[PDB]
């Protein structure tokens, strides 16, 4: 889950 875990929230630009 990247949007819902926040590192991988800010590095991609679909989350």
Not at 1 to 15: I, L
Request: charge should be negative; proline fraction near 20%.
């Amino acid at each position: 889950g990247c949007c819902s875990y926040p590192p991988c929230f800010a590095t991609n630009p679909d989350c």
